[PDB]
């Protein structure tokens, strides 16, 4: 029984203290419209999802590889002395190869949100 172990178990199996205090002390007599949700608002049986832009999911899909890159750099910073001037060059090559993909990401503009209703920029020409 170390203080670390005591704390990390005690926080979860005690965190419901004020939860129970609130459940026992506080009123609970619901209405229909107190179980409701808004000022106005409704939706028929149309669908279960909304159409979303690609960047919304691409940021999450690209979080995985860049996070794995930055987490794969942890062995290097914990081995930096032992891999002296060899692993340094190796991790630099690693970072350059992974910067090429970041360059691709920037040049494609993959996290940009595009706008449909463009403003009209075409001249007004009158057939005489």
């Amino acid at each position: 029984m170390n203080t670390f172990i005591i704390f990390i178990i005690l926080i979860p199996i005690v965190g419901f203290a004020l939860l129970a205090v609130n459940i026992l002390l506080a009123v609970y007599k619901p209405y229909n419209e107190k179980l409701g949700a808004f000022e106005c608002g409704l939706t028929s049986f149309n669908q279960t999802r909304l159409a979303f832009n690609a960047a919304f999911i691409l940021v999450a899909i690209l979080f995985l590889p860049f996070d794995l890159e930055i987490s794969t750099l942890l062995p290097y910073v914990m081995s930096i002395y032992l891999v002296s001037n060899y692993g340094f060059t190796i991790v630099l090559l690693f970072l350059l190869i992974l910067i090429i993909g970041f360059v691709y990401e920037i040049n494609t503009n993959a996290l940009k949100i595009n706008k449909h209703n463009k403003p009209n920029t075409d001249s007004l020409i009158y057939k005489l």
Binding site: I97, I100, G101, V103, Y104, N107, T108
Partner: protein, 469 residues
């Protein structure tokens, strides 16, 4: 050169439009040609079968692997030519065959994984390379995302390849649990006959083999080859097979296995019988590839199999490319475009091709009779060398099965030729559009190789006897 190509093309494609991808493919095709021309003198390193261990002991370089790499470059050259050069300068052929922006990069990364599979000496390299192949080839199946069939195939292929990769990893980690090693060089006579080790090794072999359609796990890959675009099918039906079978031939893992014999017999029978009622072209060719994969499974039981495997894989690659190119050339004369992705599906759409293009049908006949194994063509010498090896090593029932499969497969190989040399009303009399010069030359060169390569067999054997013995 491949990594230089990848790191160059990523930048150059990011900083380029979609109007430039065809020219990019042309550029990298010429790059691969220059590499295969100028750097191919490295064969002299492998004189008297000198073998080298590189990157610690993570890679192995010998004549076998150098040859497979030259072959994969040749295949990539042809497949890139099909994307970089328009067959006809019409709106139709600018709607059917357009390269997508990232396709060339994914092709080169898949080629990298292929070569790091064949060059692998440690299982960590093998697994990293298997995954680099399979992820890239998922994305290649999926890049034509405006196709329902292709997306569906992408996802099926992801899941099945994932499961088989789980199997490969289980095999590898069990091998490590037993021997505390990831290297097959750790094995010798004593370790094989002292430890029972065949379950692990055949589990690895089957996890690798079911990834190329070995029965009873063939239907999924045949559906994937059917449902993908034609110019994607031509790649995804060939290069993984070369890579994995070359690894399994270089690694002597299944020298007298009963399970591999049984499953190879099953592959032969299925790949011969199931192709008889196929009405579609790509499924027929998929079952053809299945039975050829069976013929090449047979030489995983030999321990001296380099010549037979290299001859057969080279001739099968040439024949595969030639037949897919003939089906690609036949689209100008078919009377009904089926899809934007598979413009030709059914074999009866080739009816009457001899009256529109007769020499295309001559090419088809040459390739069909090489598949059947008719002399003096190249498939005959392939089958002959395989039979030589398997009868020298004592597989006498498998030989009769091989003959019977060679005979049953000829029916669905001849379906194509038969319908092609049939008569048709509404023939072609004139056309002002001409097919490409480069692709015509490539197809003609493949056909001439199939037809006249037997002249050099003596020379090839004399070179093999110096570089592989």
């Amino acid at each position: 050169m491949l990594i230089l190509a990848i790191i160059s093309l990523i930048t150059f494609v990011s900083m380029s439009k979609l109007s430039d991808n065809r020219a990019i493919i042309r550029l990298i095709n010429i790059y691969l040609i220059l590499v295969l021309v100028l750097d191919s003198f490295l064969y002299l390193l492998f004189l008297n079968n000198q073998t080298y261990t590189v990157m610690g002991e993570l890679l192995i370089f010998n004549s076998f692997t150098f040859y497979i790499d030259m072959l994969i470059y040749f295949i990539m050259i042809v497949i890139s030519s099909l994307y970089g050069y328009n067959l006809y300068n019409n709106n139709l052929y600018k709607t059917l065959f357009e390269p997508k922006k990232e396709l060339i990069i994914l092709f080169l990364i898949n080629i990298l994984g292929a070569l790091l599979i064949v060059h692998s000496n440690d299982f960590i390299t093998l697994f990293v390379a298997i995954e680099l192949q399979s992820y890239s080839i998922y994305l290649i199946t999926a890049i034509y995302n405006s196709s329902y069939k292709a997306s569906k195939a992408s996802m099926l292929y992801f899941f099945m390849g994932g499961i088989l990769s789980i199997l490969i990893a289980y095999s590898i980690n069990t091998y490590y649990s037993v021997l505390n090693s990831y290297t097959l060089h750790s094995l010798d006579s004593l370790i094989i006959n002292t430890l029972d080790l065949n379950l692990i090794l055949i589990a690895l072999s089957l996890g690798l083999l079911f990834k190329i359609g070995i029965a009873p796990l063939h239907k999924w890959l045949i559906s994937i080859y059917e449902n993908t675009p034609i110019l994607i099918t031509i790649y995804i039906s060939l290069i993984p097979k070369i890579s994995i079978l070359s690894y399994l031939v270089l690694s002597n893992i299944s020298i007298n296995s009963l399970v591999i014999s049984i499953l190879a017999i099953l592959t032969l029978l299925v790949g011969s019988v199931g192709g008889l009622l196929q009405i579609k072209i790509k499924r027929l060719l998929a079952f053809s590839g299945l039975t050829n994969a069976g013929y090449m499974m047979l030489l995983l039981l030999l321990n001296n199999n380099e010549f037979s495997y290299l001859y057969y894989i080279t001739q099968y690659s040439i024949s595969h490319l030639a037949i897919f190119m003939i089906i690609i050339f036949s689209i100008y004369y078919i009377n009904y475009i089926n899809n934007q992705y598979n413009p030709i599906i059914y074999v009866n759409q080739l009816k009457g091709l001899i009256h529109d293009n007769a020499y295309l049908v001559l090419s088809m006949a040459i390739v069909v009779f090489s598949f059947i194994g008719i002399p003096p063509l190249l498939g005959f010498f392939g089958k002959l060398n395989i039979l030589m090896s398997i009868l020298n090593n004592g597989y006498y029932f498998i030989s009769i099965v091989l003959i019977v499969a060679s005979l049953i497969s000829a029916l669905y190989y001849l379906y194509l030729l038969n319908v092609s040399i049939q008569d048709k009303n509404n023939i072609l009399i004139n056309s002002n559009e001409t097919v490409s010069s480069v692709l015509s030359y490539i197809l003609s060169s493949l056909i001439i190789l199939i037809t006249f390569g037997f002249i050099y067999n003596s020379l090839i054997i004399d070179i093999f006897n110096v570089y592989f013995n």
